[PDB]
């Protein structure tokens with residue numbers, strides 16, 4: 001009865017999850033493509049020790065899109081505090097187990113989707129682990145998603161190995177059929193770019209005639225985007241990905257409580273200055289509004305979803 | 311539909327229940343929480359919960375889900391701290407932590423696995439099983455008892471104020487048939503029966519009470535036991551009004567199976583009819599086992615014999 005606009009979203013952990021939780025209530029068909037380059041935490045140990053892609057960002061996305069009883073949702077988010085076992089998320093372990101059974105991370109994700117009554121298609125950026133590397137300004141290379149920000153040098157660029165990393169066929173079809181393509185929100189260097197740099201994905205995005213919106217970071221991240229303005233974020237996407245990837249940039253152009261600023265300053269994070277002249281000079285549209293809530297600083301999934309569709 | 315309550319542990323209870331659920335019966339399974347070996351044991355110690363393993367298997371035996379979800383629940387990690395653990399155990403452990411209550415966790419997993427029946431733990435807290443040997447020494451822990459290389463005189467449970475669930479006692483009260491076993495005599499059947507209040511409830515019940523006797527001995531537990539030795543042990547621990555009929559495999563076993571079991575110092579339980587009659591119980595004897603190279607009860611035949 002309703003024509004649902006097809007929307008594809010690229011991201012990682014918490015930014016994607018917050019947005020999807022709201023976007024799923026709109027009249028849209030969602031495809032979420034989730035980075036498999038992380039190597040920290042429970043996800044990272046399971047990645048190394050079981051030889052599977054890191055399941056953590058996928059797990060959160062699945063929970064965000066799930067429609068199950070509150071108890072099952074808690075079960076899936078349960079984190080062991082004792083045991084070898086200590087630190088692991090039960091939902092990661094479920095994903096791990098399903099991936100072992102099927103020998104296929106993408107089939108595992110789709111089986112968990114059925115179990116969690118997920119409305120939408122969740123896909124990994126690749127069916128195998130990706131390793132993220134950072135080239136610093138001095139030319140040195142730091143390897144591993146969670147190691148890059150601890151280098152205390154400035155990132156010049158990031159890139160992925162294995163070089164013959166492949167996206168899922170379904171992923172490329174999703175981009176082809178997309179009415180809207182949303183990039184972010186998430187870490188620039190550790191979530192957005194590791195998705196966009198999968199071979200074939202930029203090419204597919206460029207050929208698409210969908211509207212392409214980049215949801216800009218609201219805060220800098222220490223060791224990743226120290227001192228970045230909004231245009232610095234967009235510039236980095238363009239330098240890695242070329243033209244035809246971003247049409248409009250969505251930015252929080254209003255102020256932030258002093259208490260929140262203070263709390264983020266303790267982690268050497270500060271607000272991303274919105275520099276409108278420089279953004280217009282990069283040739284994209286600017287969607288500026290009150291787009292964040294304090295919940296910690298998160299995007300307002302409803303306002304953002306509605307801005308990306310109106 | 312007849313109300314049937316079954317007492318057991320691991321594989322024997324699981325094999326029976328898989329068949330019995332297909333009959334017109336309402337099943338209550340009461341599962342030992344005294345085990346301390348394997349993944350179950352490590353989780354028991356490390357997370358301070360009752361051992362989830364025997365319950366996991368019972369839940370899978372009664373489940374009605376797609377084969378994939380069943381495999382997921384039975385998945386065992388081979389690498390990782392994590393290695394050796396069953397994902398189904400981990401699921402029960404997580405649910406128990408969230409609800410702070412093992413029985414409620416089991417009931418939540420029952421809904422998720424579309425379980426046909428009520429699965430209850432023997433108690434909502436861990437039970438420690440102790441074995442007093444003939445020499446008077448005590449060996450503590452379910453998985454240590456058989457390794458003692460001495461002969462068991464009796465077993466008993468701590469904590470002393472171990473309590474069964476109210477729902478368990480109701481189940482016994484309402485039962486039309488009460489089935490004891492199959493399972494290890496000293497590490498599955500007795501640890502269920504000895505929970506304070508359970509034998510009293512069974513004795514008060516007028517339900518028919520059938521004991522499914524072990525087909526094979528177990529080294530370090532029931533070496534040399536006849537069928538009457540098994541029943542006598544139940545009677546010595548539990549008194550009268552617990553067993554009306556004993557169900558036994560009175561027919562022979564393939565030589566290759568005997569040989570495979572003899573490698574583990576296990577041998578067939580000799581059915582001594584005269585001594586069984588002397589203990590005052592009825593004997594239901596038939597071909598009740600099937601052969602992998604492993605020896606299991608024929609759930610269908612057994613189910614039908616106990617419902618007659």
Ligand SMILES: NC(=O)c1ccc[n+]([C@@H]2O[C@H](COP(=O)([O-])OP(=O)(O)OC[C@H]3O[C@@H](n4cnc5c(N)ncnc54)[C@H](O)[C@@H]3O)[C@@H](O)[C@H]2O)c1
Nearest residue numbers: 014015018185186187217218219220263264267296298299
């Ligand atoms: N979640 C969203 O809708 C949202 C929106 C826009 C941008 N982003 C961007 O994604 C990037 C990565 O985000 P993130 O997941 O690391 O979140 P974050 O930058 O808001 O906080 C960092 C993460 O570590 C913890 N944390 C560290 N510092 C914190 C702080 N000062 N206050 C509260 N929690 C803190 C939190 O658990 C959080 O997940 C950030 O630059 C952020 O601005 C997220």
Ligand SMILES: NC(=O)c1ccc[n+]([C@@H]2O[C@H](COP(=O)([O-])OP(=O)(O)OC[C@H]3O[C@@H](n4cnc5c(N)ncnc54)[C@H](O)[C@@H]3O)[C@@H](O)[C@H]2O)c1
Nearest residue numbers: 321322325492493494524525526527570571603604606607
């Ligand atoms: N499952 C049933 O329907 C059933 C039937 C009759 C008796 N029982 C009794 O319950 C008691 C304990 O049962 P159990 O689970 O330890 O079963 P078991 O006695 O058949 O074998 C021991 C366990 O280790 C394995 N195993 C060890 N030795 C084996 C052998 N050599 N050949 C094949 N498999 C072997 C089995 O899979 C089993 O889990 C035994 O006395 C047994 O006879 C169970």
